[PDB]
Amino acid sequence: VVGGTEAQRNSWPSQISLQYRSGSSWAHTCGGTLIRQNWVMTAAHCVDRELTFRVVVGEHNLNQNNGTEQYVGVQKIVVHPYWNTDDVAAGYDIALLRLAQSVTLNSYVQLGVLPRAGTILANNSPCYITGWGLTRTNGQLAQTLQQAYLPTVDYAICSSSSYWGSTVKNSMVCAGGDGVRSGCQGDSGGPLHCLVNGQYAVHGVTSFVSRLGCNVTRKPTVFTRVSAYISWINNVIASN
Numbered sequence: 001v002v003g004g005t006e007a008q009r010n011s012w013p014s015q016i017s018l019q020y021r022s023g024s025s026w027a028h029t030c031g032g033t034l035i036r037q038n039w040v041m042t043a044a045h046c047v048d049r050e051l052t053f054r055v056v057v058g059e060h061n062l063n064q065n066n067g068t069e070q071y072v073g074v075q076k077i078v079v080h081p082y083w084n085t086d087d088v089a090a091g092y093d094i095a096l097l098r099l100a101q102s103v104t105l106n107s108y109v110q111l112g113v114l115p116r117a118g119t120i121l122a123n124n125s126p127c128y129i130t131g132w133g134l135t136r137t138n139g140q141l142a143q144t145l146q147q148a149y150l151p152t153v154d155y156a157i158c159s160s161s162s163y164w165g166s167t168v169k170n171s172m173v174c175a176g177g178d179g180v181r182s183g184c185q186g187d188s189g190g191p192l193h194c195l196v197n198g199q200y201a202v203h204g205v206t207s208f209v210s211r212l213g214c215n216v217t218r219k220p221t222v223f224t225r226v227s228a229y230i231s232w233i234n235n236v237i238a239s240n
Protein backbone atom coordinates (compact mmCIF):
# COMPACT_ATOMS: atom_id res chain seq x y z
CA VAL A 1 0.00 0.00 0.00
CA VAL A 2 1.48 3.35 -1.07
CA GLY A 3 0.54 6.36 1.12
CA GLY A 4 -0.98 4.16 3.83
CA THR A 5 -0.86 4.23 7.61
CA GLU A 6 -0.32 1.28 9.96
CA ALA A 7 -3.54 -0.57 10.88
CA GLN A 8 -4.48 -1.58 14.46
CA ARG A 9 -4.13 -5.37 15.12
CA ASN A 10 -7.79 -6.01 15.31
CA SER A 11 -9.20 -3.67 12.72
CA TRP A 12 -9.29 -6.05 9.73
CA PRO A 13 -9.49 -9.59 11.16
CA SER A 14 -10.40 -11.34 7.85
CA GLN A 15 -7.10 -10.22 6.20
CA ILE A 16 -4.67 -13.11 5.54
CA SER A 17 -1.11 -13.36 4.24
CA LEU A 18 -0.58 -15.88 1.43
CA GLN A 19 3.06 -17.10 1.58
CA TYR A 20 5.13 -19.56 -0.44
CA ARG A 21 8.06 -21.68 0.66
CA SER A 22 11.35 -20.09 -0.29
CA GLY A 23 14.29 -22.34 0.68
CA SER A 24 13.90 -22.98 4.40
CA SER A 25 11.77 -19.87 4.92
CA TRP A 26 8.35 -18.56 3.85
CA ALA A 27 7.90 -15.41 1.85
CA HIS A 28 4.76 -13.17 1.65
CA THR A 29 3.46 -12.90 -1.91
CA CYS A 30 -0.23 -11.89 -1.71
CA GLY A 31 -3.12 -10.85 0.48
CA GLY A 32 -6.45 -12.74 0.81
CA THR A 33 -9.76 -12.71 2.77
CA LEU A 34 -10.85 -15.59 5.11
CA ILE A 35 -14.48 -16.32 4.01
CA ARG A 36 -15.08 -19.61 5.81
CA GLN A 37 -13.01 -21.28 8.57
CA ASN A 38 -11.41 -23.46 5.89
CA TRP A 39 -11.73 -21.22 2.77
CA VAL A 40 -9.78 -18.16 1.62
CA MET A 41 -10.60 -15.86 -1.32
CA THR A 42 -7.61 -14.34 -3.24
CA ALA A 43 -6.60 -13.32 -6.83
CA ALA A 44 -6.06 -16.07 -9.39
CA HIS A 45 -2.80 -14.43 -10.60
CA CYS A 46 -1.28 -15.05 -7.10
CA VAL A 47 -1.46 -18.85 -7.58
CA ASP A 48 -0.38 -19.01 -11.23
CA ARG A 49 3.03 -20.38 -10.15
CA GLU A 50 2.94 -23.93 -8.87
CA LEU A 51 4.51 -23.23 -5.52
CA THR A 52 4.00 -24.57 -2.02
CA PHE A 53 1.59 -22.16 -0.34
CA ARG A 54 0.49 -21.53 3.20
CA VAL A 55 -1.95 -19.10 4.77
CA VAL A 56 -1.29 -17.08 7.94
CA VAL A 57 -4.33 -15.78 9.82
CA GLY A 58 -4.14 -13.36 12.79
CA GLU A 59 -1.10 -11.76 11.29
CA HIS A 60 0.05 -8.21 11.91
CA ASN A 61 3.91 -7.92 11.65
CA LEU A 62 5.43 -10.24 9.05
CA ASN A 63 8.84 -10.28 10.66
CA GLN A 64 8.10 -10.75 14.38
CA ASN A 65 5.93 -12.94 16.61
CA ASN A 66 2.59 -11.28 17.41
CA GLY A 67 1.32 -14.15 19.59
CA THR A 68 -1.93 -14.30 17.48
CA GLU A 69 -0.91 -16.20 14.27
CA GLN A 70 -2.29 -19.50 13.05
CA TYR A 71 -0.47 -21.19 10.15
CA VAL A 72 -2.30 -23.59 7.86
CA GLY A 73 -1.48 -25.33 4.58
CA VAL A 74 -3.39 -24.90 1.33
CA GLN A 75 -4.96 -28.20 0.41
CA LYS A 76 -6.90 -27.40 -2.81
CA ILE A 77 -6.84 -24.41 -5.20
CA VAL A 78 -9.95 -23.60 -7.37
CA VAL A 79 -9.34 -20.70 -9.76
CA HIS A 80 -12.12 -19.32 -11.87
CA PRO A 81 -12.63 -21.44 -15.10
CA TYR A 82 -12.36 -18.33 -17.28
CA TRP A 83 -9.12 -16.87 -15.77
CA ASN A 84 -6.47 -16.27 -18.42
CA THR A 85 -2.96 -15.35 -17.15
CA ASP A 86 -2.13 -13.63 -20.46
CA ASP A 87 -5.03 -11.23 -20.00
CA VAL A 88 -5.68 -9.91 -16.45
CA ALA A 89 -7.72 -7.11 -18.20
CA ALA A 90 -10.32 -9.68 -19.27
CA GLY A 91 -11.26 -10.14 -15.54
CA TYR A 92 -12.00 -13.31 -13.59
CA ASP A 93 -9.01 -12.67 -11.34
CA ILE A 94 -10.23 -14.73 -8.40
CA ALA A 95 -9.41 -18.06 -6.77
CA LEU A 96 -10.58 -19.94 -3.69
CA LEU A 97 -8.21 -21.93 -1.45
CA ARG A 98 -9.36 -24.79 0.67
CA LEU A 99 -7.30 -24.94 3.85
CA ALA A 100 -5.84 -28.12 5.31
CA GLN A 101 -7.55 -27.37 8.63
CA SER A 102 -10.26 -25.15 9.99
CA VAL A 103 -8.79 -22.07 11.71
CA THR A 104 -10.13 -20.92 15.14
CA LEU A 105 -11.98 -17.67 15.21
CA ASN A 106 -11.24 -15.07 17.90
CA SER A 107 -10.81 -11.20 17.87
CA TYR A 108 -7.87 -11.48 15.46
CA VAL A 109 -9.40 -14.08 13.10
CA GLN A 110 -12.92 -13.46 11.71
CA LEU A 111 -14.70 -14.12 8.47
CA GLY A 112 -15.02 -11.44 5.86
CA VAL A 113 -18.58 -10.25 5.09
CA LEU A 114 -19.34 -10.58 1.33
CA PRO A 115 -21.72 -8.18 -0.57
CA ARG A 116 -25.08 -9.28 -1.99
CA ALA A 117 -24.87 -10.46 -5.63
CA GLY A 118 -25.05 -7.63 -8.18
CA THR A 119 -24.30 -4.79 -5.74
CA ILE A 120 -22.69 -1.77 -7.37
CA LEU A 121 -21.28 1.06 -5.24
CA ALA A 122 -22.05 4.63 -6.02
CA ASN A 123 -19.12 6.80 -7.14
CA ASN A 124 -16.81 7.93 -4.43
CA SER A 125 -17.98 5.36 -1.83
CA PRO A 126 -15.69 5.12 1.26
CA CYS A 127 -13.46 2.08 1.14
CA TYR A 128 -10.14 1.02 2.65
CA ILE A 129 -7.42 -1.11 1.01
CA THR A 130 -5.32 -3.22 3.35
CA GLY A 131 -2.07 -5.20 2.83
CA TRP A 132 1.65 -5.82 3.34
CA GLY A 133 2.63 -4.91 -0.23
CA LEU A 134 5.16 -2.34 -1.46
CA THR A 135 4.99 1.01 0.25
CA ARG A 136 6.49 2.70 -2.81
CA THR A 137 6.67 1.90 -6.51
CA ASN A 138 9.71 -0.43 -6.80
CA GLY A 139 10.10 -0.17 -2.97
CA GLN A 140 9.89 -2.88 -0.37
CA LEU A 141 7.09 -4.76 1.48
CA ALA A 142 5.58 -3.36 4.66
CA GLN A 143 6.47 -5.13 7.89
CA THR A 144 3.21 -4.19 9.46
CA LEU A 145 -0.32 -4.24 7.91
CA GLN A 146 -1.04 -0.95 6.13
CA GLN A 147 -4.34 0.67 5.24
CA ALA A 148 -5.23 3.56 2.95
CA TYR A 149 -8.53 5.41 2.28
CA LEU A 150 -9.39 4.60 -1.29
CA PRO A 151 -12.83 5.91 -2.46
CA THR A 152 -14.41 4.16 -5.43
CA VAL A 153 -14.35 5.58 -8.94
CA ASP A 154 -17.46 4.24 -10.74
CA TYR A 155 -17.36 2.32 -14.04
CA ALA A 156 -18.32 5.27 -16.22
CA ILE A 157 -15.40 7.41 -15.07
CA CYS A 158 -12.92 4.54 -14.74
CA SER A 159 -13.52 3.27 -18.28
CA SER A 160 -13.19 6.78 -19.75
CA SER A 161 -10.15 7.63 -21.91
CA SER A 162 -8.36 9.68 -19.25
CA TYR A 163 -8.40 6.75 -16.81
CA TRP A 164 -8.20 3.06 -17.75
CA GLY A 165 -10.32 3.25 -20.84
CA SER A 166 -11.16 -0.11 -22.28
CA THR A 167 -8.89 -2.09 -19.93
CA VAL A 168 -11.44 -1.94 -17.10
CA LYS A 169 -14.60 -4.00 -17.35
CA ASN A 170 -17.86 -3.88 -15.36
CA SER A 171 -16.76 -7.02 -13.46
CA MET A 172 -14.20 -4.77 -11.72
CA VAL A 173 -14.16 -2.02 -9.03
CA CYS A 174 -11.78 0.92 -9.37
CA ALA A 175 -10.71 2.85 -6.22
CA GLY A 176 -8.26 5.74 -5.67
CA GLY A 177 -6.29 7.28 -8.48
CA ASP A 178 -5.18 10.49 -6.63
CA GLY A 179 -1.43 9.98 -7.33
CA VAL A 180 -0.69 9.51 -3.60
CA ARG A 181 -2.43 6.42 -2.22
CA SER A 182 -2.81 3.03 -3.94
CA GLY A 183 -2.38 -0.71 -3.80
CA CYS A 184 1.03 -1.96 -4.97
CA GLN A 185 2.70 -5.34 -5.63
CA GLY A 186 2.15 -7.80 -2.75
CA ASP A 187 -1.32 -6.31 -1.99
CA SER A 188 -2.89 -8.46 -4.81
CA GLY A 189 -5.58 -10.87 -3.72
CA GLY A 190 -6.38 -8.86 -0.60
CA PRO A 191 -9.57 -6.98 0.36
CA LEU A 192 -11.11 -3.60 -0.54
CA HIS A 193 -13.32 -3.05 2.55
CA CYS A 194 -16.34 -0.75 1.98
CA LEU A 195 -18.90 0.52 4.52
CA VAL A 196 -22.41 -0.45 3.45
CA ASN A 197 -25.30 -0.19 5.96
CA GLY A 198 -23.02 0.29 8.95
CA GLN A 199 -21.00 -2.83 8.11
CA TYR A 200 -17.62 -3.20 6.32
CA ALA A 201 -17.92 -5.75 3.53
CA VAL A 202 -15.28 -7.00 1.10
CA HIS A 203 -16.29 -5.60 -2.32
CA GLY A 204 -12.93 -6.03 -4.11
CA VAL A 205 -10.06 -8.57 -4.52
CA THR A 206 -6.93 -6.47 -5.49
CA SER A 207 -5.99 -7.25 -9.07
CA PHE A 208 -3.78 -4.67 -10.82
CA VAL A 209 -2.13 -1.32 -11.06
CA SER A 210 -0.50 0.62 -13.89
CA ARG A 211 2.69 -0.78 -15.24
CA LEU A 212 4.01 2.81 -15.00
CA GLY A 213 3.77 2.66 -11.16
CA CYS A 214 1.50 1.99 -8.24
CA ASN A 215 0.26 5.56 -7.34
CA VAL A 216 -0.44 7.09 -10.67
CA THR A 217 -2.89 9.95 -11.10
CA ARG A 218 -5.99 8.72 -12.96
CA LYS A 219 -4.96 5.10 -12.85
CA PRO A 220 -6.87 3.85 -9.81
CA THR A 221 -6.16 0.49 -8.29
CA VAL A 222 -8.40 -2.12 -9.93
CA PHE A 223 -10.16 -4.86 -8.10
CA THR A 224 -12.17 -7.91 -9.08
CA ARG A 225 -15.83 -7.05 -8.18
CA VAL A 226 -16.72 -9.71 -5.61
CA SER A 227 -20.47 -9.14 -6.02
CA ALA A 228 -20.15 -10.36 -9.64
CA TYR A 229 -18.99 -13.82 -8.31
CA ILE A 230 -21.29 -14.65 -5.39
CA SER A 231 -22.97 -17.59 -7.16
CA TRP A 232 -19.64 -19.08 -8.24
CA ILE A 233 -18.17 -18.72 -4.69
CA ASN A 234 -21.14 -20.41 -3.13
CA ASN A 235 -21.20 -23.23 -5.73
CA VAL A 236 -17.53 -24.01 -5.10
CA ILE A 237 -17.93 -23.99 -1.25
CA ALA A 238 -21.03 -26.22 -1.38
CA SER A 239 -19.28 -28.85 -3.55
CA ASN A 240 -15.64 -29.10 -2.19
Ligand SMILES: CC(C)c1ccc(NC(=O)[C@@H]2CCCN2C(=O)[C@H](CCCC[NH3+])NC(=O)C(F)(F)F)cc1
Pocket residue numbers: 045085087088089133167183184185186187188189206207208209210211
Ligand atom coordinates in the same frame (compact mmCIF):
# COMPACT_ATOMS: atom_id res chain seq x y z
C1 LIG B 1 -3.42 -3.93 -19.68
C2 LIG B 1 -3.61 -5.03 -18.68
C3 LIG B 1 -3.43 -6.41 -19.35
C4 LIG B 1 -2.57 -4.78 -17.57
C5 LIG B 1 -2.72 -3.68 -16.72
C6 LIG B 1 -1.81 -3.45 -15.68
C7 LIG B 1 -0.74 -4.33 -15.46
N1 LIG B 1 0.05 -4.14 -14.37
C8 LIG B 1 1.32 -4.60 -14.24
O1 LIG B 1 2.01 -5.22 -15.07
C9 LIG B 1 1.79 -4.27 -12.81
C10 LIG B 1 3.29 -4.04 -12.64
C11 LIG B 1 3.84 -5.39 -12.24
C12 LIG B 1 2.73 -6.06 -11.42
N2 LIG B 1 1.51 -5.37 -11.87
C13 LIG B 1 0.28 -5.65 -11.41
O2 LIG B 1 -0.59 -4.81 -11.59
C14 LIG B 1 -0.09 -6.93 -10.62
C15 LIG B 1 -1.10 -7.85 -11.34
C16 LIG B 1 -1.03 -7.94 -12.86
C17 LIG B 1 -0.83 -9.37 -13.37
C18 LIG B 1 -0.34 -9.27 -14.82
N3 LIG B 1 -0.27 -10.56 -15.46
N4 LIG B 1 -0.76 -6.55 -9.39
C19 LIG B 1 -0.33 -5.63 -8.50
O3 LIG B 1 0.83 -5.19 -8.59
C20 LIG B 1 -1.31 -5.18 -7.35
F1 LIG B 1 -1.33 -3.86 -7.22
F2 LIG B 1 -2.60 -5.51 -7.52
F3 LIG B 1 -0.98 -5.65 -6.15
C21 LIG B 1 -0.58 -5.43 -16.33
C22 LIG B 1 -1.49 -5.65 -17.37
Ligand SMILES: [Ca+2]
Pocket residue numbers: 059060061062063064065066069
Ligand atom coordinates in the same frame (compact mmCIF):
# COMPACT_ATOMS: atom_id res chain seq x y z
CA1 LIG C 1 3.98 -12.00 13.04
